[PDB]
DNA sequence: TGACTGGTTGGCCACTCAATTTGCATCTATATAGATGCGCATCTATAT
């Protein structure tokens, strides 16, 4: 539900400047609480098992560095931003790496398991027909499917009787009659070996980085390579790696994670302003364009209404949820302060702008609030408990804001999306009591005047991706891609999806479980192009280039978090279901509706 | 007393095969104009 708006914020130099020289002071002691953790700290292998940063660690690692005499001359906000930035960051890449871990193990099970029809028949000392009767027991028994046979194979060896176990989950958990191809085997038990290597590779990951601003390593390692003689060749790598680094020039930004952490105002000359907690000489006037204007005055009015009645209202309500404070990029020459832009990007909850949204939120809250209460029930726990029970109270009490009924559609209609990579989307609206679909669209239709922009994605990633690497021989600087202009698209379908569902009033809006298309995709190209080109590995990476490529530049993921954010924003459900491997793009948008309505139970 | 601040859970070449075009040689079975030979009319001559 949740969406970002932003605005630059503008002031005087002073201001800028005050701010910057805390922001380069600030990002240091986000690099030193990296380093306590990436190497200092021990017991770092048993969080890499567990997957899960402790919720205190980061904090204990920097109340004793808010005294040290390199980072002492920070408000308490700023280091609750440090300490924010980097539990974020574990608390990410530990679970990135539990899921690879996973996955290896989950894959390692099966690459056991896949045995050919021969193995089968010498591993059971039996018939494959023998093999087959058991296959038919087994789902007798079980008749969580899969799993169950999964775990049916992890328990239960049963004098290697598991072969029949193993039979049924190579055919898909379904009993075959059909003896198979030793080569097409071969092609498929060598994409697990592929999966299982490619895991065993990405299991290990680069130890999370710091954004080093200071080029003090750099500035070193150029005087050591120029003036001195490399004793090895890993040596002399090591300064290679070191010196074609490029540096950072931007500090992480501040997060506020409490919303009344800024403090809104308007100023003589009638524009909005903002100064934040710890640094409340700084005045910041707010610039941002009429069609985002009305959050940064609500900002203001959710305050004055609380500040109007004595604190008897709970900012557990407040439009505004927290606030990034960054500065992007700027163009030429300056000192940093006057060359780069500070701009705040606001959290905001959209279903908080109406009042029958905001009843959602306090319902969501208070059921929240009431449990978390009955599993707490110390000192301070007890004065956390006060914190929660004033909002428990104060959450009852009303903002006066604007009203608009909510959207609500039949139970029974769907909007199937078919993605795939000649037709990013196409759609099927089925009635699925009458099993009628109700209407269909294809691009042309999804997105009516505009559908000159597919043709100009595809013309645009071509020429600028030969542009690149024309600009690389040569070493300009002049790098560009058609990334906005998919974005963009991305957009105008996530549009044209939700006014259809609106038009026919859908309950749902279904999206495929596509998973991780890109790695299948490179195993199964891999597993093949070894067939054709053996041993001339720089062959098999050339096989097809051009369809490896289009899939990596497929931005399915993108599309779908789209769609979802305009849904959701809407009102209209979200549910998911199987694409077929087969049919038209409208046959597969059609079954996959259908599907995710045959869930429902 | 209402502000401030602090808290905190595929590509380049070499080889092969079905085909399918084009041309030439060999029947072949009919169609068609010129010798050759009776079969009678017609004229001439000869005799009682």
Redesign the pocket.
């Known amino acids: 539900s949740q969406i970002t708006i932003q605005a630059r914020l503008i002031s005087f130099e002073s201001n800028r400047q005050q701010l910057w020289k805390l922001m380069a002071d600030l990002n240091t002691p986000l690099i030193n609480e990296l380093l306590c953790q990436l190497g200092q700290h021990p017991d770092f292998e048993k969080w890499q098992q567990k997957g899960k940063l402790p919720?205190?660690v980061v904090?204990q690692l920097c109340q004793p560095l808010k005294t040290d005499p390199r980072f002492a001359g920070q408000?308490?906000?700023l280091y609750?931003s440090a300490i924010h930035i980097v539990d974020y960051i574990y608390k990410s890449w530990l679970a990135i790496q539990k899921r690879l871990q996973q996955q290896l193990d989950g894959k390692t099970r099966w690459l056991e398991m896949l045995n050919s029809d021969a193995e089968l028949v010498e591993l059971s000392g039996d018939t494959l027909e023998a093999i087959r009767v058991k296959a038919a027991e087994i789902l007798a028994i079980a008749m969580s499917l899969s799993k169950t046979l999964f775990d049916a194979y992890q328990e239960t060896e049963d004098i290697k009787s598991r072969s029949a176990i193993s039979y049924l989950l190579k055919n898909g958990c379904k009993l075959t009659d059909k003896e198979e191809d030793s080569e097409k085997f071969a092609k498929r038990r060598r994409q697990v070996e592929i999966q299982i290597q490619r895991l065993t590779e990405k299991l290990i990951s680069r130890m999370p980085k710091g954004r080093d601003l200071t080029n003090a390593k750099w500035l070193e390692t150029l005087l050591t390579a120029t003036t001195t003689v490399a004793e090895d060749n890993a040596q002399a790598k090591r300064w290679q790696d070191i010196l074609l680094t490029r540096s950072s020039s931007l500090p992480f930004p501040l997060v506020f994670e409490?919303n009344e952490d800024m403090?809104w105002s308007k100023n003589q000359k009638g524009r909005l302003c903002v100064?934040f907690?710890?640094?409340?000489?700084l005045i910041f006037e707010v610039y941002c364009g009429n069609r985002q204007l009305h959050w940064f005055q609500r900002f203001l009015e959710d305050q004055q209404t609380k500040?109007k009645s004595k604190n008897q209202h709970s900012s557990g309500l407040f439009t505004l949820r927290n606030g990034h404070l960054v500065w992007l990029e700027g163009e030429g020459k300056g000192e940093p302060w006057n060359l780069h832009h500070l701009t705040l990007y606001c959290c905001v909850d959209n279903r908080l702008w109406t009042e029958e949204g905001t009843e959602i939120v306090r319902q969501e809250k208070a059921d929240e609030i009431t449990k978390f209460i009955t599993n707490m029930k110390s000192d301070?726990?007890q004065?956390?408990i006060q914190?929660k029970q004033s909002t428990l109270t104060r959450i009852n009490n009303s903002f006066e804001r604007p009203s608009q009924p909510l959207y609500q559609g039949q139970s029974h209609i769907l909007v199937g999306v078919s993605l795939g990579l000649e037709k990013p989307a196409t759609v099927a609206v089925v009635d699925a009591i009458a099993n009628k679909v109700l209407a269909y669209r294809s691009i042309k239709q999804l997105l009516g005047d505009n559908y000159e922009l597919l043709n100009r994605q595809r013309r645009q990633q071509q020429y600028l991706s030969h542009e690149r690497h024309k600009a690389q021989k040569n070493f300009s600087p002049n790098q560009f891609g058609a990334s906005e202009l998919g974005q963009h698209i991305d957009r105008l379908l996530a549009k044209a999806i939700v006014a259809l569902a609106r038009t026919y009033k859908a309950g749902s809006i279904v999206l495929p479980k596509l998973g991780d298309m890109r790695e299948v995709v490179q195993s199964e190209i891999q597993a093949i192009a070894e067939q054709?080109?053996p041993g001339?590995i720089e062959?098999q990476q050339?096989?097809?280039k051009?369809?490896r490529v289009n899939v990596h530049r497929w931005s399915y993921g993108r599309l779908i978090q789209s769609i979802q954010s305009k849904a959701a924003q809407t009102g209209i459900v979200i549910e998911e279901g199987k694409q077929p491997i087969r049919g038209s793009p409208h046959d597969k948008a059609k079954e996959l509706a259908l599907s995710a309505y045959n869930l429902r139970l």
């Open positions: 919720s205190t904090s408000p308490s906000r609750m409490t403090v100064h907690n710890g640094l409340s000489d500040r301070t726990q004065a956390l914190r054709k080109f001339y062959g050339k096989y097809a051009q369809y």
